[PDB]
Amino acid sequence: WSRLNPLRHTAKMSMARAQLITDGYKEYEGYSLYRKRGLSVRKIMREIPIFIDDDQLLVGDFSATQMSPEWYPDLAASWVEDYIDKYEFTGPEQAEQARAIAQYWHNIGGKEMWIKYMGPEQEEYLTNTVSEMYAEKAWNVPDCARMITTGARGFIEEIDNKLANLTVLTDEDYRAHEFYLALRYELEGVIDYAHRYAALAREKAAVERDPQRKVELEEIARVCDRVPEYPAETFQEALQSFFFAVLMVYWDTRTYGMGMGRMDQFLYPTFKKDIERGYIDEKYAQDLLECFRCKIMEKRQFWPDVMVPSVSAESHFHNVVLGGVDPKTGKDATNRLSYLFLDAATKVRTPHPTLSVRWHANIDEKFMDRALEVVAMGMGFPAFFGDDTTIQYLLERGYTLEEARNYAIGGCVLHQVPGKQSSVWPIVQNYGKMLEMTLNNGFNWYSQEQIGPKTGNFLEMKTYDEFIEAYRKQCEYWAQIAANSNRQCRIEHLESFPDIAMSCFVDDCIDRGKVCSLGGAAHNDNTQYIVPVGVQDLGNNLYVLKNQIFVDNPICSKETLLDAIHKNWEGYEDLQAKMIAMPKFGNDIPEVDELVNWGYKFIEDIWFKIPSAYGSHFEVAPHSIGFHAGTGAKCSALPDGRVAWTAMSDGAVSPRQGTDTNGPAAVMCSAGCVDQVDLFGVLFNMRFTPQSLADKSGRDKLKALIETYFHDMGGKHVQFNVMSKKQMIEAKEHPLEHQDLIVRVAGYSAYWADLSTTIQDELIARSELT
Ligand SMILES: O=C(O)Cc1ccc(O)cc1
């Protein structure tokens, strides 16, 4: 009854893109890839199954059967093998169809073409090589709502004004002449897509008996008759217009961490249009935002199980930034449309649309108090981002102050302006696992193979300054060997799986006539980066290296140490308790909280002088998504009392696990001692108990503590979740029951049933605060 009604995961495998792209490549054979793609995608949207759900007033969906996740063979296809039905993956009996597409799309798929290119193929855990040929790229926020007040028609004109009055093909990239035609070809695709619903919604009208539900869709057909093609005019046809731009991208590439930030900023002129004109009510607007959280869900993920350890089983980042600052004037933009957004998170309790708030000095204290109740209930949501510091990072990249003020976020914590960055290609490297390799000697304990460089013998280091060069020499190897892989993989993805439709919403892409992935990016700045996930464990161990190994303590010699972790404290269980009691990050120890700052300052030195993509340099994104588990489980033992095969850390500057013997103010004062201005978004989450946040103390102690954390300490991002540790243990022993539990992990909340085991038991260990 609570306004909205989401439903169940009674889903099966769907072949409405794979089979529809397969015969698109065959019917449009010979046309260049830029055109053979664009011609096939409009074939999809104009021909794919369509339906309108019940009591919903949004039409376009992310699949051809309710919640059945589509499959894209353009990116990969040879991962569907022998089981016929068996593990969250299921089909009816059509396995002979997947093997038919896999037979066709063999050696012509993204990874399928990619894995030949190399030659030898080094399977890895120190870098996500498996997640770079298999995972779809997005993690941006294009201007599909900042550049959709023009409409698809206004786009096709600029393309037509381009192919005619500026072409003169003097090899002005035949690739560019074909990109232009392609971009039109699926711009009419998003027209046919919404003109199919108009004919179907109008058909769903006469046979309808409820006259209010009849007029509900009779206006939707009138919306979709003008929403995608021409510029929108009303709040009901501005949302549907923006959404169809999110789908046209999804039909060309399963847009991963695509952000849709600032819906409280660009749906306002129509919001302020219909309301003050009595055309739409606040509850009606709260209906669409409710119907927006539901319809966005169907985009489930469908990747091989070999990555579920590192990417969970349903890690979706559909973030939207509510609140903020008016760019042209500097005042606050926190408005009622932001109030209805987190009002929607009440009546519908979906965990994917992140719904993030952006704090700033003169923000609206009322709609920030009301934001603290949204995380006071279930779900660890409105991930408060602090501006002021993030602005300095964007302004020092090159963006103008208006572009910087107007920033949103893409994916987890990546903050960036809308239509400028271009489909990021990330790199994971557990800089605690590097410590394992150099404390060894490039041996990769879990693998027991001399796969690294013999930088130096630990039993012959002599001094700490000698170690940190043997740690630099080892880290730099996995730099020019990891970047060098997905650098020329973004370039290689020009023979397969480029993002043509997404270029409709990247600046200068239309002008230079080149896609955002390869070339026509307006800013090749924050477009490639690294995620160190567990660098707290670097500082905690570096402290043990700096303090209490070299100089004093020869009993805990370099020999007694390496063997203790070799056997994982077995026979040394007395020692680990002392190291686990040594000063650890998360409290308020400058002697231990400053080494994690120098830690990032050690990573920011090597990678920032490494060129990237088409220009600029690699960034450093300390965030995480689930890569602490799949990497830590293969990262064997650490000096700071760690056990062998356990996770790294909970991302960026979050305290390790049970290391905060001090209150919440310390856990942020520590995390504040990080010069996080040049850090591409920090993932900082911590757990409170519901007795603290569900009272005035939540909107009094926290606010005074989170505002102080960002203004005095220069933080960037803070995200909370309230849930008892027993409630998670009670979910571990009853996982058949709590299959719809909202648990935060790392910049998102996902159902506990699709969460990995190593992530569950790790979430038990996170401390409780008051
Ligand atoms: O988000 C990540 O860090 C992993 C990733 C790698 C490649 C890709 O295409 C998508 C995601």
Residue 364, burial from CB neighbour count under 10 angstroms (0-12, 13-18, 19+): middle
Report resolution in angstroms. 3.5
Short-list 573, 765, 596, 767, CA closest to 673: 596
What DSSP element (H or E) covers 749?
strand 749-751
Does ligand 1 come within 6 angstroms of the Cβ of 426? yes
Tell me the C-alpha distance between 424 and 409, whole Å. 13
Short-list 618, 149, 225, CA closest to 428: 618
Tell me the C-alpha distance between 443 and 454, whole Å. 8
| CA–centroid distance for 331 within its chain | 29
Short-list 731, 535, 565, 717, CA closest to 627: 535
Pairing of strands 356-359, 749-751: unpaired
Give the other-Cβ count within 10 Å of 554's Cβ.
10
Residue 722, burial from CB neighbour count under 10 angstroms (0-12, 13-18, 19+): buried
Residue whose tokens read 């299959």: 739
Going from the Cα of 139 to the center of ligand 1, the distance in angstroms, rounded, reads 8
Ligand 1, atom 2, lies closest to the CA of 426
Ligand 1, atom 7, lies closest to the CA of 132
What is the three-class DSSP state of 520?
Answer: coil
Ligand 1, atom 3, lies closest to the CA of 426
Name residue 276's amino acid.
Answer: E
Query: First vs last Cα of the chain: how many Å apart?
Result: 35
Residue 58, burial from CB neighbour count under 10 angstroms (0-12, 13-18, 19+): buried
Pocket test for ligand 1, best of 72, 74, 124, 132 (most atoms within 8 A of CB): 132
Residue 308 zone, left/alpha/beta (φ > 0; ψ -120 to 50; rest): alpha
Spell out where the chain is interrupted, by the residue before each break (C to N > 2.5 A).
86, 124
The helix-helix angle for 725-732 and 757-765 (nearest 10°) equals 150
CB within 8 Å of 539: residues ≥ 6 apart: 585, 592, 593, 594, 595, 596, 597, 598, 599
Please, are residues 654 and 685 in contact by the beta-carbon 8 Å criterion?
A: yes
Domain layout of the chain by residue ranges: 1-770
Short-list 138, 22, 131, CA closest to 70: 22
What is the three-class DSSP state of 344?
Answer: helix
CB within 8 Å of 508: residues ≥ 6 apart: 520, 521, 522
Does ligand 1 come within 6 angstroms of the Cβ of 131? yes
Tokens read off for 96 = 């002979």
Tell me the C-alpha distance between 441 and 444, whole Å. 8
Tell me the C-alpha distance between 438 and 468, whole Å. 10
What DSSP element (H or E) covers 468?
helix 464-477
Pocket test for ligand 1, best of 137, 253, 310, 427 (most atoms within 8 A of CB): 137
Residue whose tokens read 């919306």: 223
Tell me the C-alpha distance between 728 and 743, whole Å. 9
Tokens read off for 54 = 């019940």
